[PDB]
Design a protein around this ligand. Sequence first.
Ligand code: SAH
Ligand code: SAH
Lengths: 279, 275
Amino acid sequence: DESYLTFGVLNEKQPGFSWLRVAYGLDPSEERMRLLLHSQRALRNVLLDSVDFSRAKSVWDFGCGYASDIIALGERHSHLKLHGHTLSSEQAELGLRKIEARGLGGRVQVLRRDSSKDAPLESAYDVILGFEVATHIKEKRSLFQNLSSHLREGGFMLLADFIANASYNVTPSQWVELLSEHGLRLVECVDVSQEVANFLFDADFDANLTQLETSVGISAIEKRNYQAMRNFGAALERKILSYVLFIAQKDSHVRSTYLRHINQKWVEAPAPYAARELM
Amino acid sequence: ESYLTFGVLNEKQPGFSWLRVAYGLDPSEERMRLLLHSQRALRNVLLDSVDFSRAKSVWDFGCGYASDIIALGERHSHLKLHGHTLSSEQAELGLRKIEARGLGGRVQVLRRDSSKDAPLESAYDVILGFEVATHIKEKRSLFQNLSSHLREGGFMLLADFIANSYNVTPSQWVELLSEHGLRLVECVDVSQEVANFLFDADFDANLTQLETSVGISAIEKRNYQAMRNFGAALERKILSYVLFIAQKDSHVRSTYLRHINQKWVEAPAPYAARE
Ligand SMILES: Nc1ncnc2c1ncn2[C@@H]1O[C@H](CSCC[C@H](N)C(=O)O)[C@@H](O)[C@H]1O
Ligand SMILES: Nc1ncnc2c1ncn2[C@@H]1O[C@H](CSCC[C@H](N)C(=O)O)[C@@H](O)[C@H]1O
């Protein structure tokens, strides 16, 4: 169910569409449910389409939430081992419950580990996922040292995060130094700022949120995430932030000066989402 | 020493004639230094991407007079470097330069056909191809032989032409790279800069002054004309001179490999806007 509570991309604003109402079934429209799931799948696929998971063994989600992402990957590719890190003992035990109910206990794990300073289970992951996690970590240099040192050579880091133009948002120059100092080479950056803003736009958001608080009930962690998502959409509309998808690879053999060059190209000139079609 | 490629000039240099300088009509040392610097700058765009202190093995599958692998060998005393050529003369001259430098252990030059013949090592960290693939017809066979001896994550550095001597369309480049697991890190367009290197307003007069005071033969004179026409075709943009920085990547999804390779071949970085 938590998989319905993530970002998505809409090419234009849809009057009557409210990601909050649709995800919770308050909107009974089957076609709007299709739109919600499609827009969330389209955003995830920008990152996931780069990886041939038949040639991958281990995945690390270093801020997994309720582990919706790694559970879906585990059910889609039944050979994958997926590890998630979370700071919340609540989320950690609720995630393993969801994992138990789906018979995924042999492959999918959720650990209460601080990804900024705590090493994961595997020495080298083939894929590392970070969807809106680094923005909530201020010790980003310690974090990217931990991520890169546990990424296989040539392995993929797949980030969805914010660029500045309680979150700790950083500038394009700071992203370039983060990746370059730890041997991470961008294959592509994709800017989805406007399309995510369209997805997040709910002009009845305040009314819709209060309805969920009193008519279905909401935990404090959930209400804080929903209000954060709304404020993120406003920052995107105001162009204070960009939402960018990073596809990077661990590369220890490229010269450091060239690494900074090619990371700067992608960070300062990401591909616009509306111009891409991969098939 | 000597390079069998073009160079890059940031702008047109009047009075500079690649034909006069490289073939001994012009005694100016400054213009000879310009020629060599323009040629070093072209290949340095490719070479400066590789941390050679972390490489052990380099394959130049069209080494010419072996000047590149000799310069790399003197630069990095740990590297092993192997060059292929089809020219007995070039091989003997390169080997003689290698022996004069005391590089006979680490630097090898063989007369072998890179389109079908296996190199000395099973896998290389770096493969170099500066104006080589354009002269090879069975390119699918060539890229299979190159990719099969490239370490995972290893580099392939190519200076070649894109047809907008056997030139290859943008779509053919994307398929040649993608079907052999090669992923472009970057493409750099040096078309106008090579056109500047090859620009000579007095070409026809210089080629005649080179024809009567130097021995040329008709084979060389026609090659010299073909190079001038190549420069003009770059100006007309029916041809592109492009530097490919590729890596062996067998883990990227094939669909995404084609997308990224198409992006760099269709939209390469202009040389003038690179810091
Ligand atoms: N330093 C850190 N180490 C491990 N997990 C962290 C972390 N900082 C934040 N997180 C985790 O990141 C999650 C929220 S931000 C990421 C949410 C996730 N991408 C999703 O879509 O579900 C929370 O579960 C929190 O525990
Ligand atoms: N099929 C083939 N196999 C091996 N070498 C080849 C080849 N086809 C062409 N060559 C070689 O590729 C070279 C092209 S001229 C390039 C020379 C060198 N790269 C330089 O920078 O100076 C020639 O030396 C030629 O002998």
